[PDB]
UniProtKB/Swiss-Prot annotation, chain A:
DNA-dependent RNA polymerase catalyzes the transcription of DNA into RNA using the four ribonucleoside triphosphates as substrates. Belongs to the RNA polymerase beta' chain family. The lineage of its organism: Bacteria, Thermotogati, Deinococcota, Deinococci, Thermales. The RNAP catalytic core consists of 2 alpha, 1 beta, 1 beta' and 1 omega subunit. When a sigma factor is associated with the core the holoenzyme is formed, which can initiate transcription. This is DNA-directed RNA polymerase subunit beta'. It comes from Thermus thermophilus (strain ATCC 27634 / DSM 579 / HB8).
Swiss-Prot record, chain C:
The gene is rpoZ. It comes from Thermus thermophilus (strain ATCC 27634 / DSM 579 / HB8). This is DNA-directed RNA polymerase subunit omega. Signal peptide: none annotated. GO terms for cellular component: DNA-directed RNA polymerase complex. It is an enzyme of class 2 (transferase).
UniProtKB/Swiss-Prot annotation, chain D:
GO terms for cellular component: DNA-directed RNA polymerase complex. This is DNA-directed RNA polymerase subunit beta. DNA-dependent RNA polymerase catalyzes the transcription of DNA into RNA using the four ribonucleoside triphosphates as substrates. It is an enzyme of class 2 (transferase). PANTHER family: DNA-DIRECTED RNA POLYMERASE I SUBUNIT 2. InterPro entries: DNA-dir_RNA_pol_bsu_ext_1_sf, DNA-dir_RNA_pol_bsu_external_1, DNA-dir_RNA_pol_su2, DNA-dir_RNAP_su2_dom, DNA-dir_RNAP_su2_hyb_sf, RNA_pol_bsu_bac, RNA_pol_bsu_CS, RNA_pol_bsu_protrusion. Pfam families: RNA_pol_Rpb2_1, RNA_pol_Rpb2_2, RNA_pol_Rpb2_3, RNA_pol_Rpb2_45, RNA_pol_Rpb2_6, RNA_pol_Rpb2_7. Keywords: DNA-directed RNA polymerase, Nucleotidyltransferase, Transcription, Transferase. CDD domains: RNA_pol_B_RPB2 (cd00653).
From Swiss-Prot, chain F:
Inhibits all catalytic activities of RNA polymerase (RNAP) by partially occluding its substrate-binding site and preventing NTP binding. Interacts with RNAP. Belongs to the GreA/GreB family. Residues 1-72 form a coiled coil. This is Transcription inhibitor protein Gfh1. GO terms for biological process: DNA-templated transcription elongation; regulation of DNA-templated transcription elongation. Gene3D superfamilies: Transcription elongation factor, GreA/GreB, C-terminal domain (3.10.50.30), Transcription elongation factor, GreA/GreB, N-terminal domain (1.10.287.180). The gene is gfh1.
Length: 266, 244, 93, 1083, 183, 154
RNA sequence: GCGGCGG
DNA sequence: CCGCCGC
């Protein structure tokens, strides 16, 4: 599937030639970035209120006791008005949005759904009809890594695989006692950087720098668990996918004549 | 598609070849060809252009008086044609639908065969608005059809666009599926190996879209809704219109 | 397209599974001799210059043709790795 | 065949010398045909006077440059790989401080190439072309500022590249901004340097601006005058002696940096008009009298302040306006490098003034032809501008002879910035074809010039118009400069006229790139002809007016790839330029003066002029074109014939009868076949192959060298070390292969031996043919340049006949391109009522989507010509009209159906049946007689056609006609390598090829993915192993297959192995492991 | 272009070939028109053996010389080739290989000439028209490779697009044209 | 800021957005067909369909912008000529009658019953703020003609 | 690596 | 993007 999704999203790119879009919007979207026309998202979830004219206008999300001041230049176009509610990560300005901010305010389940849809948006307007499945597979990998704030094994300034932490935390509370919670922070790395820092050394030796990659992988006697097409390609071994699939790479065929014949050997 | 789901894969393959064979044969015997007269010009073209033409004088006389701003003049004229051209569009088609149901050029277009409404219009009706170098569309439209001789200048004027399109197809083609490249870079390790993963944390696919005109819940387009739900697996059961 | 590829797919739990069984089976058809079939009687494959597909044109064609019927069995761990090839040489000249 | 043309727009003046661009450019470049008493003022001589008066006291001056004895002749230059250059020397005299003595003498300073009668050059063996160039004509312009929508900035650009890039900007914070080469400084600072005092300056400058408060500001640096010259020098980034070392300032004075362009119109034109007024000298040059004069500086700012103030004259300069765009003719290009060489030589001679004993030094001691030769030579053989002469067919070469490029020096235009330049600008009218540009990246950046477009005194492509006074049109034509065209109100040529008087009230005209309906009283100028709007290349498409510009392009470019067919036929329907192209191109040979013919050999043509001279005109028999196409001159004149001046004596490559012809006119039915003409396939009638309709001759030039190794000279003899005698037959001449032999793939073309052996030029897989000419260059070289080590060279020309086959691709002038899908037996292909079958069947479907009605038109007219037996000439926008065609088609019905009535028979039961389905279709007026009906159906351009396979009609009239279609330089000979196994690189292990083994297609990751996705495990494994690196894998594989067995299983790819070690070679220790983390052995 | 980047960036394949493609109307999505002459070379080794299987040649080296200079080999060498290809399939590739359908598998049916006959319906899959486009062809050596090639890689088996669940074997212009005029 | 329109102006513009929506859905289909067509690819087909589609999308954005933040002023009564006011001007000398209605820049349309003139229009500027009886002029290519506000009507 | 064409 | 042709 990894492939298949990458493909289905790539071909179409060939026809995607204020607010800016097309390939660049697709590159900007896959790559967590700060688009041309940024739109200030609301970090606090309350109601809206404005202050008109004055070389600067201001949109204010206020409620219980505090208001998150939003400075909207005299040349911005805001469409939320003096009065009603605004959830975290809601467009306070008009145009494109910045993933990082939207991740902080609303949360991850929103970033993901944002990316997916905001991506489709372009292909849709270009006639292309591709299943969300694929934009999902990709995007998921864009948040397969998370930072650390509460340590147990390694220190808290690291960026490691999300699931590798679900293993640590699972066996730290479950099998071996002493609930040393491993608090982490979801991280929206860019597609390119997700790739850059992809766990297996074999794969790193390929794109970035082969010196650094092997250097570090040297010190910590790294064991490249052979899974993934790239790395396993080099081995020149059958790919882990397709027919190589661990699921079927081992399958036996017999004839009722030779089967009863094994019982004849018994 | 139906045959695929209904009778199986290979059987469908059979039907495809089948259609392929007949479609082709009938195609040769049908006797369809193109001839300059086959591109028929609507009698009303001379009408709508005249109606729009006089209408243009009104806009002119109106500015030569001082009523409309330098800009308003422009925008109003474009509107004049933008509609006039669309008018002639449905006209040519109306002429084929009522008088020449079996027109070669037409039949080609209607049937998923070849041709596009917009093109058909450049032959029988008229391709009218071609933009200048920058982007601001031209004030004068291309009154001609290809059937009749596209004039010297009208051609030249139209040239600008064809060139910008070529440039666009260039730098966009040679991008070399750049995205197919990067995409592959981040998804080249993803594969399917499993046993129904036990973790049931699902994504709820929205069936309604927020604001464009203002706050008002709408039903996401048929297309898109499909895109998000087709071939999916329901996280949890849902009784909807009587079915479980 | 192919003969009962539909039926075939419905006999396996996964697509790629089919291929594997199909293949390895083609291997046994030639390795341990070409008579290690299960449907040689009336209704076995065939060619058109003469009726000689009865000996060794395309292996896979046989495999699939044989798998279409409930003659062969395929599984994750049906028979002990090494013992399979030893018994086969013995009963097939 | 009668020739009828439908032109109604009085084409006032004939087209100009189509290759004038290059021709004249070189003539004026190097005025070597006329004496030095009236020697020119530009090119060569100008560049001479330029860096000649040498002053180091030393004094070496120019006298006269003479050259003219071409070492060898053209053809010789081609057969010998010799460059066709002229010897160039010049008289130079050295005057001494010792006023009483001087020295005159001559020194030959290298050879310079010459220009052929066609306009092409001959460098190292082959013919090359020097393509035109466009850029920002070194002048002064004012463009709006980048980000700040506020005010605009001034630009001062003068080539060459050495010259400084000057800009002028005014900022908020304060004053002026004049940045030269990555840095900025006060605009006043310099002014003060020159003499412009606060007082005088402000007064005349700010007398209307108020900005001046920007300049008069120096109250500190503005009160010291000369000292400001030193002050400015400090502002140079480098730390250098403050002792008045004009140097870097000397640079932007008069000599190098600005320009030595001809005084008066070169840069001055951009001066006078655009801004300021008079020029002194050549550029802002005046380093005379201790003080400096810069009549250019203040004006530039004097317009800046005018620009930001009022409408003293609205100068917002549109960069792309061809009026600020110059085209570099060959001459200017060659001359340019010439003065660079002149400079390079002048460099050493000054060094050689202090280096020797006074009078002891004379011409030689000051001159070395080393600089100039490497200079020029480098341009013709290395410059990214001189290229292979695209000679697929004459026309082709001709276009390539006149196309304009943007990329080049790099200082004119680059790669990544062009969206702006790529557009066909307003000003391109009649100066640049809007259709000639190529598809894909590099679009709109490289394009051929227009019809009448001719380069003036300094580049600006001028175009011809017709001045009109009152309601009267004149023949008095003027070639206007892009800028000058805007001042007037020009009108189209389509404007109805009664000789000299206009005919309508609302008569179209275009003010300034703007369509406007003007009055007869306001028409100041009129267009010459519709032709001028496009290129020669484009001007060849029949009903261009009915063809979408986008496809028209495909159509123009396709002609450039037409290939010479033995039987050359001019288009059943022409534009009106075919005659001309063959004429100004030099394909055919014309008669100079009136006279009679003597000998009409098949190799030569000797005629006797009535004046008193009898000349022998040899005919290039069968020469190898650059692209490998036949180039023969076939005499069209009989012995003893009275020839008119300028009459075709012999026909060129594709020009038969004197008309241009590429491809042939074939009868064509426009309908769908099984699927043989599916997406863009074409069906062909075996019948075509029979009359050698589409057959082109081709030549491949295989070359082998007798290299000199320190292991023993590679001799060239009949001795073939491995004992064959059956492969030594054709190789009769000791070493060489015999002329007229049939060489097949794998035969020996030439034999050779080298040290430890048979190293012999063999027939490379693919094909050979018949050996037709052979060239050997032994020891005592007559006048050839044999590279070093190269003992002797051997050239072998081979040719064969290209009959049209399934892989080949043809296409019409409108843009319908396609490949032959099936060659049908005349037996069963679409035949007409009368036995005549069609030749090709085009699929209708490819016409609607693409917009090119033009073809469907040509076909209709082409149908008339078949039964009317006549060819027609339809002008670009002024050609044949829909009514006139129906008229000729009506005439054609009397030939087709008329002879039918007399011959004795009527209508078929089939003809009646299709008529039923036709009336029910609405093609025929119900109620008329079949006779009458069919006529009305024929006029539509459609006739009845019976299947041929079934003999049953094809329900519904189908259109048919004579469409002119060509075969392209696309043979399938370049399209199919079939490799089973063979040679592998010895460095990387790749199935590379070379001689006998073809290469294997690459698989790239782009395709691996493709496989990965499929789940194509082994299919992928196989591609990376058994088929590529596992030397033991591919081995077992081969063997197995030899055995009819089942390929072995893959062992660790050497790439894995090779990696373990590469990793062992370093500290890193890559250890493979088992199930339970334990070792495992690759070996 | 180092060594770690070597195993991935790609390389040239044995048992390959490429030619100009031409539409093959009669041909079924199942098959593909391949030039015998090309097949000969493509399936050379496989042919050699079959040559000995049939009296045409005594041994391999003989069968090879037999094809070294001889002009036709007529019906018999041909009978053998056509016999060796029986149920085997080859792969085809189109210029830019964009999606998994960029390469499809077909059963080769030997034909005259130079061009390669391709099925019309798959012309959509590979962005491929007939104005001279050329496709490359490959051969699955292993009986395992052959298997997957014809099972999960053949054309007629990959009808739907992995992009969207919509078909890619959609009838194109000509077919539709016909089918419409008749209904 | 704010855009002002008449009830008639609102309906007209709202309907326009509706029509343009159907046009956009139709231009969509076409583009989709072309992209999957890929027969005679790389030609006018795509660039044209996409360009047309763009011109549409642009008119839609400007229509959705003006319609989302416009105000409605109920002014059938009043005296001074303001937005929505339908004035009638009589050329003194010739006695020529003219019917005009000044409205916001977005409502302007020479095709309406009374010629809808932009608020920020030269003629539109001159008329706003004046009442029945007034006399004023502005520049005109041929010269300068003064008109007298004949009457002010709803 | 520079240049030209084709899809 | 891949394929070729040449200093
Ligand atoms: Mg194509």
């Amino acid at each position: 599937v990894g492939i298949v999704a990458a493909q289905s999203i790539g071909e179409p790119g060939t026809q995607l030639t204020d607010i800016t879009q097309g390939l660049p919007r697709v590159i900007e979207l896959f790559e967590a970035r700060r688009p041309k026309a940024k739109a200030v998202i609301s970090e606090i979830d309350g109601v809206v209120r404005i202050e008109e004219t004055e070389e600067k206008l201001s949109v204010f999300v206020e409620s219980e006791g505090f208001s998150k001041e939003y400075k909207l230049p005299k040349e911005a176009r805001l469409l939320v008005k003096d009065g009603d509610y605004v959830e975290a990560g809601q467009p306070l300005t008009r145009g494109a949005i910045d993933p990082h901010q939207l991740l902080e305010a609303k949360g991850p389940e929103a970033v993901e759904r944002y990316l997916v849809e905001e991506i489709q948006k372009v292909y849709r307007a270009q006639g292309v009809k591709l299943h969300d499945k694929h934009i999902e597979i990709v995007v998921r990998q864009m948040m397969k890594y998370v930072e650390v704030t509460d340590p147990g094994d390694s220190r808290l300034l690291e960026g490691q695989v999300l699931e590798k932490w679900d293993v640590e935390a699972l066996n730290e509370r479950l099998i071996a006692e002493g609930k040393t919670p491993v608090a982490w922070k979801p991280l929206l790395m860019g597609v390119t950087k997700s790739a850059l820092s992809t766990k297996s050394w074999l794969s790193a030796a390929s794109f970035q720098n082969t010196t650094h990659v092997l250097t570090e992988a040297a010190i910590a006697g790294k064991k490249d668990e052979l899974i993934g097409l790239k790395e396993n390609v080099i081995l020149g071994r059958l790919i882990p996918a397709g027919t190589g699939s661990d699921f079927v790479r081992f399958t036996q065929v017999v004839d009722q004549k030779t089967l009863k014949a094994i019982e004849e050997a018994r | 598609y139906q045959a695929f789901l209904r009778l199986g894969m290979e059987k469908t393959a059979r039907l495809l070849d089948a259609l392929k064979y007949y479609g082709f044969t009938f195609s040769t015997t049908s006797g369809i060809t193109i001839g300059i007269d086959d591109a028929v010009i609507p009698e009303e073209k001379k009408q709508y252009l005249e109606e729009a033409d006089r209408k243009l004088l009104q806009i002119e006389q109106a500015y030569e008086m001082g009523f409309l701003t330098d800009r308003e003049r422009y925008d109003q004229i474009l509107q004049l044609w933008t509609e006039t051209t669309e008018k002639v569009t449905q006209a040519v088609f109306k002429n084929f639908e009522e008088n020449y149901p079996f027109n070669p050029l037409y039949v080609m277009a209607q049937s998923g065969a070849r041709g596009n409404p917009q093109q058909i219009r450049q032959l029988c009706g008229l391709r009218g608005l071609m933009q200048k170098p920058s982007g601001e569309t031209f004030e004068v439209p291309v009154r001609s059809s290809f059937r009749e001789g596209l004039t010297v200048l009208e051609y030249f004027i139209s040239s600008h666009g064809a060139r910008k399109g070529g440039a666009d197809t260039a730098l966009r083609t040679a991008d070399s599926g750049y995205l197919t490249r990067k995409l592959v870079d981040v998804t080249h390790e993803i594969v399917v190996r499993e046993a129904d993963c036990g973790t049931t944390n699902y994504i709820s696919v929205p069936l309604f879209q927020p604001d464009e005109v203002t706050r008002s819940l709408r039903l996401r387009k048929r297309a898109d809704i499909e895109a998000g739900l087709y071939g999916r697996v329901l996280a949890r059961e849902v009784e909807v219109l009587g079915v479980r | 397209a192919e003969p009962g590829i539909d039926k075939l797919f419905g006999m396996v739990d996964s697509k790629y599974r089919l291929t594997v069984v199909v293949a390895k089976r083609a291997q046994q058809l030639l390795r341990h001799g070409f008579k290690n079939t299960v449907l040689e009687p009336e209704e076995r494959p065939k060619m058109q210059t003469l009726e000689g597909l009865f000996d060794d044109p395309n292996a896979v064609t046989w495999a699939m043709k044989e798998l279409l019927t409930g003659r062969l069995v395929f599984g994750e761990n049906l028979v002990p790795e090494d013992r399979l090839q030893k018994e086969m040489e013995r009963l097939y000249p | 065949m009668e020739i009828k043309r439908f032109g109604r727009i009085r084409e006032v003046i004939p087209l100009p010398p189509l290759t004038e661009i290059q021709v004249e450019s070189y003539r004026r470049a190097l005025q070597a045909d006329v004496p030095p008493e009236k020697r020119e003022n530009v090119g060569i001589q100008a560049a001479f006077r330029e860096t000649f008066p040498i002053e180091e006291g030393l004094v070496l001056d120019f006298l006269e440059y003479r050259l003219g004895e071409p070492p060898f002749p053209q053809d010789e230059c081609r057969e010998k790989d010799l460059t066709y250059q002229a010897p160039l020397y010049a008289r130079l005299q050295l005057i001494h401080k010792d006023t009483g003595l001087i020295k005159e003498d001559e020194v030959f300073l290298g050879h310079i190439p010459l220009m052929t009668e066609d306009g092409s050059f001959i460098i190292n063996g082959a013919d090359r072309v020097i393509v035109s160039q466009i850029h920002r004509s070194p002048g002064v312009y004012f463009t709006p500022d980048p980000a700040r929508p506020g005010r605009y900035i001034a630009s001062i650009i003068p080539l060459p590249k050495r010259g400084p890039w000057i800009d002028l900007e005014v900022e908020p914070n304060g004053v002026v901004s004049m940045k030269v080469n990555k840095r900025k400084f006060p605009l006043v600072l310099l002014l003060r340097v020159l003499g412009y005092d606060q007082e005088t300056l402000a007064r005349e400058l700010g007398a209307y601006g108020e900005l001046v408060q920007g300049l008069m500001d120096e109250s500190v640096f503005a009160m010291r005058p000369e000292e400001a010259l030193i002050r400015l020098f400090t502002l140079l980034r480098p730390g250098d002696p403050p002792k008045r070392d004009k140097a870097v300032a000397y640079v932007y004075g008069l000599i190098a940096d600005p320009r030595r362009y001809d005084l008066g119109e070169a840069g001055r034109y951009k001066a006078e008009e655009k801004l300021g007024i008079r020029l002194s000298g050549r550029t802002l040059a005046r380093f005379e009298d201790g003080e400096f004069k810069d009549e250019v500086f203040l004006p530039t700012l004097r317009y800046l302040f005018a620009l930001t103030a009022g409408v003293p004259g609205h100068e917002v300069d549109d960069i792309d306006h061809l009026g600020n765009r110059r085209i570099r003719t060959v001459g200017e290009l060659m001359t340019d490098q010439f003065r660079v060489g002149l400079a390079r030589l002048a460099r050493g001679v000054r060094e050689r003034m202090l280096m020797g004993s006074e009078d002891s030094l004379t011409p030689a001691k000051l001159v070395n032809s080393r600089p100039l030769e490497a200079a020029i030579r480098e341009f013709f053989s290395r410059s990214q501008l001189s290229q292979f002469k695209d000679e697929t067919n004459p026309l082709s070469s001709l276009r390539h002879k006149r196309r304009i490029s943007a990329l080049g020096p790099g200082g004119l235009t680059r790669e990544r910035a062009g969206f702006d330049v790529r557009d066909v600008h307003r000003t391109h009218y009649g100066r640049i074809c809007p259709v000639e540009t190529p598809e894909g990246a590099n679009i709109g950046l490289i394009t051929s010039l227009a019809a009448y477009a001719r380069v003036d005194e300094l580049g600006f492509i001028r175009t011809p118009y017709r001045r009109v006074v009152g309601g009267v049109v004149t023949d008095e034509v003027v070639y206007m400069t892009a800028t000058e065209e805007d001042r007037y109100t020009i009108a189209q040529a389509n404007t109805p006229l009664e000789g000299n008087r206009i005919a309508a009230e609302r008569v179209v005209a275009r003010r300034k790139g703007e369509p406007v309906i003007v009055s007869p009283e306001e028409v100041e100028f009129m267009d010459v002809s519709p032709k001028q709007v496009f290129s020669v290349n484009t001007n060849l498409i029949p009903f261009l007016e009915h063809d979408d510009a986008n496809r028209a392009l495909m159509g123009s470019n396709m002609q450039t790839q037409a290939v010479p067919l033995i039987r050359a036929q001019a288009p059943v329907v022409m534009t009106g330029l075919e005659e001309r192209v063959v004429r100004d191109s030099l394909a055919a040979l014309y008669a100079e003066e009136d006279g009679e013919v003597a000998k009409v050999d098949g190799n030569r043509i000797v005629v006797r002029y009535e004046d008193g001279r009898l000349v022998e005109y040899p005919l290039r028999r069968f020469y190898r074109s650059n692209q490998g196409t036949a180039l023969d001159q076939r005499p069209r004149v009989v012995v003893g014939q009275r020839v008119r001046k300028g009459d075709l004596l012999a026909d060129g490559p594709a020009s038969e009868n004197g008309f241009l012809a590429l491809g042939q006119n074939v009868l064509v039915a426009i309908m769908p076949f099984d699927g043989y003409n599916f997406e863009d396939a074409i069906v062909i009638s075996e019948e075509l192959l029979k009359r050698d309709f589409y057959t082109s001759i081709h030549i491949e030039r295989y070359e082998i060298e007798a290299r000199d190794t320190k292991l023993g000279p590679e001799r060239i003899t009949r001795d073939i070390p491995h004992l064959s005698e059956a492969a030594l037959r054709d190789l009769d001449e000791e070493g060489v292969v015999r002329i007229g032999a049939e060489v097949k793939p794998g035969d020996i073309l030439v034999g050779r031996t080298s040290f430890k052996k048979d190293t012999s030029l063999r027939v490379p897989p693919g094909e050979g043919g018949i050996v037709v000419r052979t060239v050997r260059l032994r020891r005592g070289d007559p006048g050839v340049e044999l590279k070093p080590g190269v003992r002797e060279v051997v050239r072998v020309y081979v040719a064969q006949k290209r009959k049209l086959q399934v892989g080949d691709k043809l296409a019409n002038r409108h843009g319908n391109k396609g490949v032959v899908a099936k060659i049908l037996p005349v037996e069963d292909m679409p035949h007409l009522p009368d036995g005549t079958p069609v030749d090709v069947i085009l699929n209708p479907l490819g016409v609607p989507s693409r917009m090119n009605l033009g073809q469907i038109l040509e076909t209709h007219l082409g149908l008339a010509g078949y039964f009317l037996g006549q060819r027609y000439i339809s002008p670009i926008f002024d050609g044949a009209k829909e009514p006139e065609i129906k008229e000729l088609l009506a005439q054609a019905f009397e030939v087709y159906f008329g002879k039918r009535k007399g011959e004795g028979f009527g209508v078929d039961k089939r003809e009646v049946e299709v008529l039923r389905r036709a009336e029910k279709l609405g093609l025929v007026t119900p109620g008329k007689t079949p006779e009458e009906q069919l006529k009305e159906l024929f006029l539509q351009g459609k006739v009845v056609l019976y299947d041929g396979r079934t003999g049953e009609p094809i329900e519904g009239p189908i259109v048919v006609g004579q469409m002119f279609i060509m075969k392209l330089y696309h043979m399938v000979e370049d399209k199919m390598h079939a490799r089973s196994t063979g040679p592998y690189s010895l460095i990387t292990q790749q199935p590379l090829g070379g001689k006998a083994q073809f290469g294997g297609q690459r698989f790239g990751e782009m395709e691996v993915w493709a496989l990965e996705a499929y789940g194509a495990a082994h299919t992928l494994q196989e591609m990376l192993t058994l088929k590529s690196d596992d030397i033991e894998g591919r081995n077992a594989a081969y063997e197995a297959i030899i055995k009819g067995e089942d390929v072995p299983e893959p062992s660790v790819p050497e790439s894995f192995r090779v990696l373990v070690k590469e990793l062992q070679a370093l500290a890193l220790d890559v250890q493979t492991l088992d199930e339970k983390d334990n070792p495992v052995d690759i070996f | 272009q180092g060594r770690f980047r070597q195993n991935l960036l790609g390389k040239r394949v044995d048992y390959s070939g490429r030619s100009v493609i031409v539409v093959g109307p009669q041909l079924k999505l199942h098959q593909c028109g391949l030039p015998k002459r090309m097949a000969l070379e493509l399936f050379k080794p496989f042919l050699l053996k079959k040559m000995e299987e049939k009296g045409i040649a005594p041994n391999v080296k003989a069968a090879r010389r037999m094809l070294e200079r001889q002009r036709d080999i007529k019906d018999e060498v041909w009978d053998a080739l056509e016999e060796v290809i029986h149920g085997k399939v080859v792969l085809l590739n189109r210029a830019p290989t964009l999606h998994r359908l960029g390469i499809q598998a077909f059963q080769p049916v030997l034909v005259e000439g130079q061009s390669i006959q391709l099925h019309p319906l798959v012309c959509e899959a590979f962005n491929a028209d007939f104005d001279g486009d050329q496709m490359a062809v490959h051969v699955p050596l292993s009986s395992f490779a052959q298997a997957e090639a014809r099972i999960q890689m053949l054309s007629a088996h990959n009808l739907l697009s992995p992009a969207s669940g919509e078909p890619l074997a959609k009838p194109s212009r000509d077919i539709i044209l016909g089918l419409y005029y008749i209904t | 800021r704010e855009v002002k329109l008449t009830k008639a102006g609102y309906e007209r513009l709202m309907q326009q957005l509706e029509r343009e929506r159907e046009r956009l859905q139709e231009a969509t289909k076409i583009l989709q067909e072309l992209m999957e067509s890929s027969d005679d690819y790389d030609d006018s087909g795509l660039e044209a369909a996409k360009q047309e589609k763009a011109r549409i999308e642009a008119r839609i954005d400007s229509l959705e912008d003006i319609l989302s933040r416009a105000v409605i002023l109920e002014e059938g009564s009043g005296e001074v000529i303001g937005l929505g006011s339908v004035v009638e001007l009589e050329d003194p000398l010739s006695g020529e009658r003219l019917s005009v209605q000044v409205v916001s820049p977005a409502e302007a349309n020479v095709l309406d019953t009374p010629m809808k003139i932009s608020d920020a229009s030269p003629m539109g500027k001159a008329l706003l703020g004046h009442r029945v009886g007034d006399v004023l002029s502005l520049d005109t290519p041929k010269g300068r003609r003064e008109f007298r506000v004949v009457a002010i009507h709803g």
